[PDB]
Amino acid sequence: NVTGLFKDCSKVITGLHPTQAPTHLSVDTKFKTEGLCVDIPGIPKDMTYRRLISMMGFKMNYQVNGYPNMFITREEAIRHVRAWIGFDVEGCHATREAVGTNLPLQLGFSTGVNLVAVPTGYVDTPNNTDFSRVSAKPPPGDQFKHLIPLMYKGLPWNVVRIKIVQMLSDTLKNLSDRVVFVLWAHGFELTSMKYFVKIGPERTCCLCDRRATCFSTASDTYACWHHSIGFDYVYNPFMIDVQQWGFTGNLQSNHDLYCQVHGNAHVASCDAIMTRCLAVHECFVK
C-alpha cells in the first residue's frame, strides 16, 4: 500500500497542490476526484512551505547491468576481511517543525573514530529540496544522555563527509581496493550513507589504474584510496548486516560470547568495534 521512504514529516495538516506534490498520494484530498486529480480555479499553490522528507526505508535491491550491488554475501565478505570497517550511527530525532524521522548525529567506525554532524535533513520547498540544518533533539532516556552535548558540537555535512573519506582512505589504502561496512541492523546506517555515499558503474582512479573508491563533486572525478585527498564521497562501497546471520538478542550479548577485550563504552564507535569483532570471531575463530 504505502512505504515510509520519503514520508512527509511536516506538521502541516493538508497535502500539496497538484503542481507541487511529488506524488499522487501527497496531493491534498480536496483535489482528488474520479480516480485522479483536478486543478481547482482559485485554489493557489503554497509558496512558503518547508516539508521535511524522511530518508528511512531505502531498499538497495536494484539489479542493473554494470552497477555492483552494495550488499554482499557472507562468503564474499569473508574474502574481503581486510576491507571490513564496522559502522554504527547514533541518531537524533526531528522536532518542532517536523516529527517522525531519525537524523545522523554521531557516526562511529571500528577505527575508533566518532564524527559528530549538525542535525541535517532533506527539506522539500516550492523550488527544490534544501539539504539543511533542522530542529532536532536526542531521544529521551538515561541511555541517550551522552548525546546531549553532541547537539552543539556537530560539523556541517560537507566537512563530515570529507573526514569520512580521509579516514577510510588512510585506513584502507594498503589493505584493500574496496570497503565493506560491517553493520548490525543496517536500516539507519543505510539512511546515514545517503549523506556520504554515491553509486554508479565501476570506475578507475584519476591518477592510477585502481578501482575508484571515492568521488569528488568539485570536479566530477573518481579516485582510489591512495589518491582521494580532498574527495567528498565514498563511491561504490560494499556492506553486510551481521544481525542477519542467525543471532538472537542484542549486539553486545552476541559480541560478548566470544570477546572480553571490548567493554561496552556506549558510543557509536564502540558498537562499530563490537560489530566488526563479532563478525571476525564468527568467521575466522575456532
Binding site: 503542481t19 511529488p22 485522479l36 486529480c37 531505502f58 527544490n128 545517503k194 554515491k198 554508479g200
Partner: protein
C-alpha cells in the same frame, strides 16, 4: 507520525536513483535492465482542449497529450536530490506538464530525455512548430 508520499513499487528505483552520482543515467539504465517506470505520478483530469504547450500554469493537454503535476514528473523532485540547473531550482515543480499520450506510461523518463522549445513552447519532436 507523518504522512506517506510513496508506494512500495517505487522503493527500488527511487533508492537507486537517490544514491546515484548520475541520477538521470541511473534511471535510463534501470529501465534498460527491465525496471518498471516510476508510478504514483499526479495525473490530471482535464478537457483535452488546451494549447498543447509543454509547461503551463494550468492543465493544457490537447487530444494527443495528458496533463500531469510537474513535480511528480521530475526525477530530481521524486528522489529529493539536487537539480541540474545552475541555481538548483526546478522548471517543472509549480507547473503542469503535458506529456504525449504515447509516452504517458513513463512521464519521468519523458521529461529526462526531452527538451522544450523556447520559441514555440512545445516539446522538440512532439509538437514544436519550428524546424
Amino acid at each position: 507520525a507523518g504522512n506517506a508520499t510513496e508506494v512500495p513499487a517505487n522503493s527500488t528505483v527511487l533508492s537507486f536513483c537517490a544514491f546515484a552520482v548520475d541520477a538521470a543515467k541511473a534511471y535510463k539504465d534501470y529501465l534498460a535492465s527491465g525496471g518498471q517506470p516510476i508510478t504514483n505520478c499526479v495525473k490530471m483530469l482535464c478537457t483535452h482542449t488546451g494549447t498543447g504547450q509543454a509547461i503551463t500554469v494550468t492543465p493544457e493537454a490537447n487530444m494527443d497529450q495528458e496533463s500531469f503535476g510537474g513535480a511528480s514528473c521530475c526525477l530530481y523532485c521524486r528522489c529529493h536530490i539536487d537539480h541540474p540547473n545552475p541555481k538548483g531550482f526546478c522548471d517543472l515543480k509549480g507547473k503542469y506538464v503535458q506529456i504525449p499520450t504515447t509516452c504517458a506510461n513513463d512521464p519521468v523518463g519523458f521529461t529526462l530525455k526531452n527538451t522544450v522549445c523556447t520559441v514555440c513552447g512545445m516539446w522538440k519532436g512532439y509538437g514544436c512548430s519550428c524546424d
